[PDB]
């Protein structure tokens, strides 16, 4: 199944934060309505925040997370969780190799903000 795609409420500010846990350099592309809205690139084996930004979900609300290492797409896992019918997390893990820890880039999207 498709992973890393989330439908947010339209025209809503959200946070997107990427963590790295791999020897490979992680490149994270955040698309809003199928257009790149933020790009992160970094390397860490210690869960470093390689990027964190506030974006707007735009007219469509479609947010997509892509992860690649040396130009090759990582395998993604994702889900959305809602607490007390209000607090939203969209969660992504990715695997760039063979050990299947799925933490090589970890992306957390959260809303509402403010």
């Amino acid at each position: 199944a498709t992973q890393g795609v989330f439908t947010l409420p339209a025209n809503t500010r959200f946070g997107v934060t990427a963590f790295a846990n791999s020897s490979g350099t992680q490149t994270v592309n955040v698309l809003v309505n199928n257009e790149t809205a933020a790009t992160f690139s970094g390397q860490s084996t210690n869960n470093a925040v390689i990027g964190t930004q506030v974006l707007n979900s735009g007219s469509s609300g479609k947010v997509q997370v892509q992860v690649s290492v040396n130009g090759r797409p990582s395998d993604l896992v994702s889900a959305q969780v809602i607490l007390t019918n209000e607090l939203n997390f969209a969660l992504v893990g990715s695997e760039d190799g063979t050990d299947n820890d799925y933490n090589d880039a970890v992306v957390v999207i959260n809303w509402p903000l403010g």
Partner: peptide
């Protein structure tokens, strides 16, 4: 890390 290194085989 790459080849030969902590692949995830459990050997």
């Amino acid at each position: 890390k790459x080849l030969x290194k902590x692949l995830x085989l459990x050997l």
